[PDB]
Amino acid sequence: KRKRKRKRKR
């Protein structure tokens, strides 16, 4: 369904 992934650079 609503499968959201989140990335983060630093």
Added chain:
Amino acid sequence: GGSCLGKKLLEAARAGQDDEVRILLANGADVNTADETGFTPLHLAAWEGHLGIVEVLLKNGADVNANDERGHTPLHLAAYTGHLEIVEVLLKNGAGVNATDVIGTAPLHLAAMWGHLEIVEVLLKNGADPKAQDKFGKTPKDLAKDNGHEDVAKLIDKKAQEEEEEEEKKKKILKDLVKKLSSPNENELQNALWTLGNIASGGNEQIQAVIDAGALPALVQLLSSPNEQILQEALWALSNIASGGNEQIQAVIDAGALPALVQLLSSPNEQILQEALWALSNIASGGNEQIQAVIDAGALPALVQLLSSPNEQILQEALWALSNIASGGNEQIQAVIDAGALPALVQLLSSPNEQILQEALWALSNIASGGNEQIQAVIDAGALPALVQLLSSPNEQILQEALWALSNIASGGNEQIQAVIDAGALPALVQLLSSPNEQILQEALWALSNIASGGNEQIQAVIDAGALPALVQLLSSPNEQIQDEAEKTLLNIANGSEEQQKAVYDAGALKYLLIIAAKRGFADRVRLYLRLGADQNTADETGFTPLHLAAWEGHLGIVEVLLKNGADVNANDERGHTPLHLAAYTGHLEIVEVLLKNGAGVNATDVIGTAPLHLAAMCGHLEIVEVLLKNGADVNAQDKFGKTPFDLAIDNGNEDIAEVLQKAA
């Protein structure tokens, strides 16, 4: 505000009245409006050369880089004409100096097409590419040749020549700094080492220049340096390179950096360990295959072991690294599960450290973004009870990350959705639908919609949690994204049994759903709500009916459907406006004719005595004025201010309408 307000702005700029442009915005509306050729009032103001119009158009908050149907920008139009003191006002407030159209030409491509003088000086100072040609294949230096004028073409080739010299001075310096990375003098090494890493901290293009100089193999070799100060700065440089695009990440991988970074995860020096975690986290921000290279290097067992670190700061970095790995596909997510991270991640949800709590929620949220068996692995690890408890956290960021994790779990099958329900999440979710935090509102609304898209048992549990009254109440929210997601939730609930569909309508949702559908534009949903029993004549507290909305928004299909279902064609709001008023003001000709066809009052006056002929004659809607006169519009009607429609056409400068009115009188 209205489509009447931003009507003559387009021709006031094309004419050139600072005053008329000024009064057209004075009340406040759309600073940049539409056009048949996709133009905006900023484009035509710079084409004709009215400097007093391009400056007033951006001090209120418009957009300097607007595109038409061909991609033309205000800078492209300011260079075709040759107006200098109109170019820099665009360059001052962020304008695409190298903006490309569908033609491929640039402002300096066209500045040399006509051979313009001082306008090339300011675009080159702002970094205008002279080397990039169009799709024809003729550079700006070449278009000045074919024009027959080599005045500023000499300035074009010098800047291009100086650009070639400076790019080769950079490559000369970068190559020598890479050479100094092999120096036996540690002072000379670190001076070069810090310089390269500092350059790599800039944009993605500066990172490529460091890569193109061959710095990566030297930086990887420095990762085994006995000097921990050199080793730390080498880690800092590689981490800066890995913060760029996926191509730069892959170059770090192809340079063989991962085996050294994994080994550095066992370093007792916590500054070096933090930098290695920094570098690995940036590489794991890449695509799935770049995340997999980190996995294939054996980083997972060290990361999971770092989740038991006493150092709470190092623990946040290991969580950051794991969260990026779990942002990949199911193969990458399953590797994190197989490494044993879920038991440690669930245990970390009981940490009193709120920063560790957020970082642990991030990792679980990404793992829960995978397939159903990956979601089930999160459920099997016991995350749901801790997640539900975190919904009562005073920290709104921890609450927002917990809602995100619950939304990802609720995106699986009915068995995973039912697990969320069994953990007692719905009461907290329904209560969060009254949160003043609008971001928490959407997050709780996203979670409920995923639950509502399950079986009839999962839909029934949503109803039993009292969600319908709060969901119906959200249909009147000023945020339209909240209206839409609350509409989607109520639609998923209506897709259950006939009893569940009846409960949505006994909650009074059809009144507000019809209002939403009348504004959006799709008529089949309007037919749906009407067919299901929505009252077409129900007005708001303002007296606005669905027939008012579509006439204001310009939805001809909805206007016709509503009239076919017995909608009051002459319904009045609290101001006395009929749908004919709204359509004659916004300039929708077809809607005006349909209303008049269905018996709309051609001479109806509002509270201040304004007739539809007043609005059409005021706004420059020539065709609507003509149509109104055919249906018997009173040419001599006066509002409360003693203005006839002929007077209003004169006070607005609509001479074509004034000519028709003075002789139809």
